[PDB]
Amino acid sequence: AFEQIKKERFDRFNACFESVATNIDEIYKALSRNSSAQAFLGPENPEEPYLDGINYNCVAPGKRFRPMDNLSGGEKTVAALALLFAIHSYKPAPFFVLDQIDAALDNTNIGKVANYIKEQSTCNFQAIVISLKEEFYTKAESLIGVYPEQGDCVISKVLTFDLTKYPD
Amino acid sequence: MYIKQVIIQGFRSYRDQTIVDPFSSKHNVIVGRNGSGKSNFFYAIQFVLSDEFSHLRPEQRLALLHEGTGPRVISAFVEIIFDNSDNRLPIDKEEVSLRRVIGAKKDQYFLDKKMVTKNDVMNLLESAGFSRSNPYYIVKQGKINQMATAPDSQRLKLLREVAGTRVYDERKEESISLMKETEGKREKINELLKY
Amino acid sequence: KRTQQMLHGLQRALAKTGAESISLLELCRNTNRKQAAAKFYSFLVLKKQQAIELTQEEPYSDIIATPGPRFHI
Amino acid sequence: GFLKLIEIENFKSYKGRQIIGPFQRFTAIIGPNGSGKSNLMDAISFVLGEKTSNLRVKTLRDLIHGAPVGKPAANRAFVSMVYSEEGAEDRTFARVIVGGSSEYKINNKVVQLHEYSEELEKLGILIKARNFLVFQGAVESIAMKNPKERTALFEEISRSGELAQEYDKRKKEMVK
Amino acid sequence: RKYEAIQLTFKQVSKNFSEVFQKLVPGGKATLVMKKGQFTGVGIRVSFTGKQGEMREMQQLSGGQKSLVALALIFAIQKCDPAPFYLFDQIDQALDAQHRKAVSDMIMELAVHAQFITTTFRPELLESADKFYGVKFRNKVSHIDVITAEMAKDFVEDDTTHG
Amino acid sequence: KRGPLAKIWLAAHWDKKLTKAHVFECNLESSVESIISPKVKMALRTSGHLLLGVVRIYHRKA
Amino acid sequence: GISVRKRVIKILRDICIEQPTFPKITEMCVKMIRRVNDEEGIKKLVNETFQKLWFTPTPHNDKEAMTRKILNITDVVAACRDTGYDWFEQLLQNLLKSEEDSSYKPVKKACTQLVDNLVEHILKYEENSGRLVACITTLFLFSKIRPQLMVKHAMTMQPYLTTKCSTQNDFMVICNVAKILELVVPLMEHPSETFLATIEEDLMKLIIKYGMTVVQHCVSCLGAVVNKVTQNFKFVWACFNRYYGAISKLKSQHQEDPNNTSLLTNKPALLRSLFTVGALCRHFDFDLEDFKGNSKVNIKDKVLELLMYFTKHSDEEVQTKAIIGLGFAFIQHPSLMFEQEVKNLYNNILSDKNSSVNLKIQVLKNLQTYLQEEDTRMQQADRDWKKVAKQEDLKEMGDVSSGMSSSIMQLYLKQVLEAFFHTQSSVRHFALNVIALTLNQGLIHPVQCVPYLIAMGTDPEPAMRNKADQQLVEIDKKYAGFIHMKAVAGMKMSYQVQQAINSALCSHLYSMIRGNRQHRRAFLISLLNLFDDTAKTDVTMLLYIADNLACFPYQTQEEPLFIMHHIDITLSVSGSNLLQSFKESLIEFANVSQGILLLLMLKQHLKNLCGFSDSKIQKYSPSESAKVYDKAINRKTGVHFHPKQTLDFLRSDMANSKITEEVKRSIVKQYLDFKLLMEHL
Ligand SMILES: Nc1ncnc2c1ncn2[C@@H]1O[C@H](COP(=O)(O)OP(=O)(O)NP(=O)(O)O)[C@@H](O)[C@H]1O
Ligand SMILES: Nc1ncnc2c1ncn2[C@@H]1O[C@H](COP(=O)(O)OP(=O)(O)NP(=O)(O)O)[C@@H](O)[C@H]1O
Structure with a gap:
């Protein structure tokens, strides 16, 4: 009976986890638009994986192997975006909700991120983001301005705007 | 500077x-x-x-x-x-x-x-x-x-530090223990004096 | 400040016909995408500055604007 | 399907009823600071379900518009989306709050949490997992977690958390 | 003597805080209230855009508002008794152009007492600066040197490519 | 270093070189303790330090 | 320790000062220079000891004693020449760098006096040659560490370069003096053009008369001198023209005539042509505007295609020379590695169980030289920062010059890893050199090739696993978890390696993983229980793991009690079931019974190694207390009988499966042995 239940947990956990691992490696390789990046998602104690840590080591685009804490936030967020996108690509999910991910990213990195978002957005999932840098919602096709109003308390309202009658 | x-x-x-x-x-x-x-x-x-x-x-x-x-x-x-x-x-x-x-x-x-x-x-x-x-x-x-x-206590500690009132606090509480120990010692002293 | 300079630009763009009705569709008929979005967000920050009141009824249509209190004249 | 549009009422600085417009394939929600835009996401996390502690407000009673200032407006709230999928039908989910409790609606009929949940589980979203929402500052804290929490998430998505009690009960018995 | 110092310093910082926060935000007011006592905490009561109805608590705010509170406090506690030097890392992410212009004007006026180093990705923060710097990273080592204002103001926004 | 209260400095910072000959009769407590209260431009930090010094001195004598 | 080091070095200093002409002086110098980089205090003391023992101003009198010291230094270097020069060079860095200020400049005068006096000794030498080449080698090292010391005498060194003999040491003279010239020529204050002319002339004369490595190491110097001062690149252009034309004529003649006789006649020209085109394209890029003098025809693609053609042929040496050429071509343009043909070629040659044994060695040598050259170029290009830095953008952040070295590795690593499991030894030695030289620059992710890098510690040759294990401890000391993650696969791969090749081999890892209590319990419980109870693990594997377990040093008391406890429990249940099923009722029985009996005997041998009563063991229970069993286990000397016992029981097994009636009788005897084991107290 113990063997039965261990087979259950092991079978499910390992199937999902290995699929995620291979897919995160390919996804990150694709995401940096370079070819020298790695990301390894490895379990500990591989005889009973379901009860131990599952560690995560990623390499920067152009530097040495360092512990995850040492790496800067700008790479950190790209790693997190990759991991998220992988997790979704295992078992589909109808939408994202991205909220000011461009906290520390430079304009160039957000532009590359936008190119990925745009090529992926068509036939796989709907994605709604809140951001400030216009370089992230420029690839978008319809904008949603949201404005407050002074009063006894701040009462807010919404209004839309189309963007598919414009050049490049 | x-x-x-x-x-x-x-x-x-x-x-x-x-x-x-x-x-x-x-x-x-x-x-x-x-x-x-x-x-x-x-x-x-x-x-x-x-x-x-x-x-x-x-x-x-x-x-x-x-x-x-x-x-x-x-x-x-x-x-x-x-x-x-x-x-x-x-x-x-x-x-x-x-x-x-x-x-x-x-x-x-x-x-x-x-x-x-x-x-x-x-x-x-x-x-x-x-x-x-x-x-x-x-x-x-x-x-x-x-x-x-x-939480508020953290800001209270921060402003209190800004006032410059940490070393005095730490030294006074440290000194109280030693002085109390001297109080016990003085008790011992009086005992031995009576003998 | 580029913003308040553009605000004077808004004043002069309004002062030409005097029908107190700036349409959005017309104002964006012949521009590129990035600057159009920039101008739209500028409409938003203008609504923040209380110098203008805007109206929109349908989900997708032009916005109709009129000067409010702090227009600075 | 996809996420067509939503509906707000009195929830977190949105007085009255107004209809968020139809969503295109890939939209964005822009606006200047302090305008109150995060709270639409809060609404989304409340229709699809999220524990109240994650909703950046204590006690669930300051949810009603104007309560954290000091004066409420009514004793209701009503947030609701309209999921549109293939087949030319349209579903209307809802969730209204009363007193402390919260009641869920499917097709404008009062339901209990469990069946509503099971419908979502058919659709493909594990609310307890919390693997597809990212608040203001958590994009960093996705990486720097202690590995256990990440294992917890991976165990949650994989339907292997229900089989826990079975496991350790068997464990105690066999070791005995 | 300690108790007396506590009293006077609380008064001074409270007043200066009210001043700075009223100046930064175009309309509003905020103050620092003590709690029940001995003392146990310091709370803050802030309000804007209604000016009488608003009376806030902490958990329901925005990034910009919270960051403004903190930066205002930093500027205030400086205006009481200046500190050696301030270095700011990625402070500007939350605020808007209006707030950023305001903070830059406060920096420009407040500059004459202490030293300021800071980083950013936005142009506005270098509206008020004497001399810049730069940081180049080649061959797996990092270098730092001075550059001129023109290339900086160009680099900050005008280009959006991979170089 | 230099001054008529340097011993209390030493007892408040290093305290280890302080010998039984130093502690014994160098300082008349009741005068320096009076000295602490009205001295011009006394830092509170230094005041606490000097407190620790004189109390440790008293402890050693006891 | 740090005490003992200081004391022994003090003793050594007094030895080398007081009674010289002792035989073991040289080795003492070798060991002390070996320890220069270990620590800080030791560093300071060795630095001051070497500053007072040799590099002292040595005033210009009693020159014979000075010469005897010179003899001492030459002897030291000539004996340590076998192993390496890294420690000596590091020491020289330390002594020179350590006085950058004015500070009376005590060493600069003395060192320059040592080099000029060696020059003078060389002068009066006139005609033991081992000492000659060793002195020239010492000159070479002293030039490498700093070039200013040997500026004046190079023109006087020129006559040796002109002509020499066909012996080894002489060849060493030629390469080293070329190296010196390479190092010194650009800094030479205003040289004479005819001197350069005769230099280049005899360099070509040397090229056309000697072996491989010397040609390489001199055309290097040729490239350096042409790229620093002169401009007559038409010469090298014409040389490459002749060779290029030659190889094209050979290729064309061979393309339709695979049976011609010209190959058996012109073999030397063909071999030399391959080597020369490789070295020439490597060191000095003539694919530019003026070399051709017209529109480029992508000659690099040409030579690549011609060599790639000549790869498929009937001899072997030709293939070796062609791959060496390909590597040299690679050393200038890394992007060429990306081509599909070279990629697929390498990944076919290294795998598929190929006949050749020289190709693999050559491949690993290619990777090693690529890695070293790239590292050194990057470093010495960092050295001269300020002169060229200011004219590169800030918005670019180039990557194709930096990331490449990682990506390339990603195409071969795994295969290279597989190439660890080869029966020859030289291939293993160079493979381990390649991977452990790779990893120290962080190019690749460590934990996917950790188990293999641990299991390679159970080879016979000592230097191999010495380097391996040292590298592993360096991998471990930073990152706590890594080794603990992959441990059972480690020993499994180790066992596969041993069964491919044919005490306490695994002891080093076992000692390393003893720090964490839970990890310690974990790996042991997992491996021991999984293998023995229900898995049809190889009997040889069981023997390997059993011997390793018995050999393991134990420094606490938790381990024997824990292992004994769990073995007992499983033994009890399994064995009981087994015996009742056999009595109630079969080669399957024979196998599983062999398993269980070996584990039994392990338990018994352990119990004999401690000589503890079963009562005390059974008294122990898991997680009783952290501090109760803190006694170090005493070990009786020379009781290591586990090997012998296992050979006895292996003979009882007899390595015979399902052949004869007699083995069935042995099976019955084995069941009787189980009954006896039950009987035993
Ligand atoms: N000891 C180190 N050796 C080499 N590289 C290092 C070392 N420490 C950090 N780095 C790298 O240095 C880079 C810059 O780090 P850091 O200074 O944190 O960037 P940052 O300026 O904070 N990034 P950002 O906030 O997005 O502007 C990172 O890619 C690190 O991996
Ligand atoms: N129920 C409520 N009724 C009215 N106002 C509220 C309510 N709850 C919060 N607020 C206030 O309204 C604003 C909404 O905050 P929040 O939704 O976090 O804004 P945000 O979208 O993060 N702002 P920003 O990122 O700067 O664009 C804050 O000033 C709150 O204090």
């Missing part, structure tokens, strides 16, 4: 940093491409004057030292020269130099080539105006928000 300039050798990604054109007094903004290594500058500037950063375990301390190519350094060192023209810092010079040699088993502060005792310097910076343990007035990338959602 007025940070004139800094010199770095082998810390994190500054292998050998010779002299740079000195700072100004008013406003010197640094900009740079994503991943260049500008926060590590401030990590150096705070690794010297603030004790808290160098409290991690040896594994991280070894990680701290730069390891790019060629040989492997073992003794990194950072020097700072600033001017206490207002004599806020007491020992009179025009360009004070302080360096912190870092090694796996070595940790030294050279103040004008004369040895120190790692405590006089802490009391020096505290008496000068610095606060060796306070994260305040050094703001890392991302932890500004936490100053607002912090």
Whole structure:
């Protein structure tokens, strides 16, 4: 009976986890638009994986192997975006909700991120983001301005705007 | 007082940093491409004057030292020269130099080539105006928000420290235990006197 | 400040017909995408500055604007 | 399907009823600071379900518009989306709050949490997992977690958390 | 003597805080109230855009508002008794152009006492600066040197490519 | 270093070189304790330090 | 320790000062220079000891004693020449760098006096040659560490370069003096053009008369001198023209005539042509505007295609020379590695169980030289920062010059890893050199090739696993978890390696993983229980693991009690079931019974190694207390009988499966042995 239940947990956990691992490696390789990046998602104690840590080591685009804490936030967020996108690509999910991910990213990195978002957005999932840098919602096709109003308390309202009658 | 300039050798990604054109007094903004290594500058500037950063375990301390190519350094060192023209810092010079040699088993502060005792310097910076343990007035990338959602007691401690009322508090509570022990001793004394 | 300079630009763009009705569709008929979005967000910050009141009924249509209190005249 | 549009009422600085417009394939929600835009996401996390502690407000009673200031407006709230999938039908989910409790609606009929949940589980979203929402500052804290929490998430998505009690009960018995 | 110092310093910081926060935000007011006592905590009561109805608590705010509170406090506590030097890392992410212009004007006026180093990705913060710097990272080592204002103001926004 | 209260400095910072001959009759407590209260431009930090010094001195005598 | 080091070095200093002409002086110098980089205090003391023992101003009198010291230094270097020069060079860095200030400059005068006096000794030598080449080699090292010391005499060194003999040591003279010239020529204050002319002339004369490595190491110097001072690149252009034309004529003649006789006649020309085109394209890029003098025809693609053609042929040496050429071509343009043909070629040659044994060695040598050259170029290009830095953008952040070295590795690593499991030894030695030289620059992710890098510690040759294990401890000391993650696969791969090749081999890892209590319990419980109870693990594997377990040093008391406890429990249940099923009722029985009996005997041998009563063991229970069993286990000397016992029981097994009636009788005897084991107290 113990063997039965261990087979259950092991079978499910390992199937999902290995699929995620291979897919995160390919996804990150694709995401940096370079070819020298790695990301390894490895379990500990591989005889009973379901009860131990599952560690995560990623390499920067152009530097040495360092512990995850040492790496800067700008790479950190790209790693997190990759991991998220992988997790979704295992078992589909109808939408994202991205909220000011461009906290520390430079304009160039957000532009590359936008190119990925745009090529992926068509036939796989709907994605709604809140951001400030216009370089992230420029690839978008319809904008949603949201404005407050002074009063006894701040009462807010919404209004839309189309963007598919414009050049490049 | 007025940070004139800094010199770095082998810390994190500054292998050998010779002299740079000195700072100004008013406003010197640094900009740079994503991943260049500008926060590590401030990590150096705070690794010297603030004790808290160098409290991690040896594994991280070894990680701290730069390891790019060629040989492997073992003794990194950072020097700072600033001017206490207002004599806020007491020992009179025009360009004070302080360096912190870092090694796996070595940790030294050279103040004008004369040895120190790692405590006089802490009391020096505290008496000068610095606060060796306070994260305040050094703001890392991302932890500004936490100053607002912090519980009130944290801000009370922060402002109370701003008032400059920490050393007095600590020394008084430490002294109370010793004095009470002397009270017991005096009791013993009276006993023996009667005998 | 480029913004308040553009605000004077808004004043002069309004002062030409005097029908107190700036349409959005017309104002964006012949521009590129990025600057159009910039101008739209500028409409938003203008609504922040209380110098203008805007109206929109349908989900997708032009916005109709009129000067409010702090127009600075 | 996809996420067509939503509906707000009195929830977190949105007085009255107004209809968020139809969503295109890939939209964005822009606006200047302090305008109150995060709270639409809060609404989304409240229709699809999220524990109240994650909703950046204590006690669930300051949810009603104007309560944290000091004066409420009514004793209701009403947030609701309209999921549109293939087949030319349209579903209307809802969730209204009363007193402390919260009641869920499917097709404008009061339901209990469990069946509503099971419908979502058919659709493909594990609310307890919390693997597809990212608040203001958590994009960093996705990486720097202690590995256990990440294992917890991976165990949650994989339907292998229900089989826990079975496991350790068997464990105790066999070791005995 | 300690108790007396506590009293006076609380008064001074409270007043200066009210001043700075009223100046930064175009309309509003905020103050620092003590709690029940001995003392146990310091709370803050802030209000804007209604000016009488608003009386806030902490958990329901925005990034910009919270960051403004903190930066205002930093500027205030400086205006009481200046500190050696300030270095800001990624402070500017939350605020808008209006707020950023305001903070830059406060920096420009407040500059004449202490030293300021800071980083950013936005142009506005270098509306008020004497001399800049730069940071180049080649061959797996990092260097730092001075540059001129023109290339900086160009680099900050005008280009959106991979170089 | 230099001054008529340097012993209390030493007892408040280093305290180890302080011998039984120093502690014994160098300082008349009741005068320096009076001295602490009205001295011009006394830092509170230094005041606490000097407190620790004189109390430790008293402890040693006891 | 750090005490003992200081004391022994003090003793050594007094030895080498007081009674010289002792035989073992040289070795003492070798060991002390070996320890220069270990620590800080030791570093300071060795630096001051070497500053007072040799590098002292040595005033210009009693020159014979000075010469005797010179003899001492030459002897030291000539004996340590076998192993390496890294420690000596590091020491020289330390002594020179350590006085950058004015500080009376005590060493600069003395060192220059040592080199000029060696020059003078060389002069009066006139005609033991081992000492000659050793002195020239010492000159070479002293030039490498700093070039200013040997500026004046190079023109006087020129006559030796002109002509020499066909012996080894002489060849060493030629390469080293070429190396010196390479190092010194650009800094030479205002040279004479005819001197350069005769240099280049005899360099070509040397090329056309000697072996491979010397040609390489001199055309290097040729490239250096042409790229620093002169401009007559038409010469090298014409040389490459002749060779290029030659190889094209051979290729064309061979393309339709695979049976011609010209190959058996012109073999030397063909071999030399391959080597020369490789070295020439490597060191000095003539694919530019003026070399051709017209529009480029992508000659690099040409030579690549011609060599790639000549790869498929009937001899072997031709293939070796062609792949060496390909590597040299690679050393200038890394992007060429990306081509599909070279990629697929390498990944076919290294795998598929190929006949050749020289190709693999050559491949690993290619990777090693690529890695070293790239590292050194990057470093010495960092050295001269300020002169060229200011004219590169801040918005670019180049990557194709930096990231490449990682990506390339990603195409071969795994295969290279597989190439660890080869029966020859030289291939293993170079493979381990390649991977452990790779990893120290962080190019690749460590934990996917950790188990293999641990299991390679159970080879016979000592230097191999010495380097391996040292590298592993360096991998471990930073990152706590890594080794603990992959441990059972480690020993499994180790066992596969041993069964491919044919005490306490695994002891080093076992000692390393003893720090964490839970990890310690974990790996042991997992491996021991999984293998024995229900898995049909190889009997040889069981023997390997059993011997390793018995050999393991134990420094606490938790381990024997824990292992004994769990073995007992499983033994009890399994064995009981087994015996009742056999009595109630079969080669399957024979196998599983062999398993269980070996584990039994392990328990018994352990119990004999401690000589503890079963009562005390059974008294122990898991997680009783941290501090109760803190006694170090005493070990009786020379009781290591586990090997012998296992050979006895292996003979009882007899390595015979399902052949004869007699084994069935042995099976019955084995069941009787189980009954006896039950009987035993
Ligand atoms: N000791 C070290 N040796 C080499 N590289 C290092 C070392 N420490 C950090 N780095 C690298 O230095 C780079 C810059 O780090 P850091 O200074 O944190 O960037 P940052 O300026 O904070 N990035 P950002 O906030 O997005 O602008 C990172 O890619 C690190 O991996
Ligand atoms: N129920 C409520 N009724 C009215 N106002 C509220 C309510 N709850 C919160 N607020 C206030 O309204 C604003 C909404 O905050 P929040 O939704 O976090 O804004 P935000 O979208 O994060 N702002 P920003 O990122 O700067 O664009 C804040 O000023 C709150 O204090």
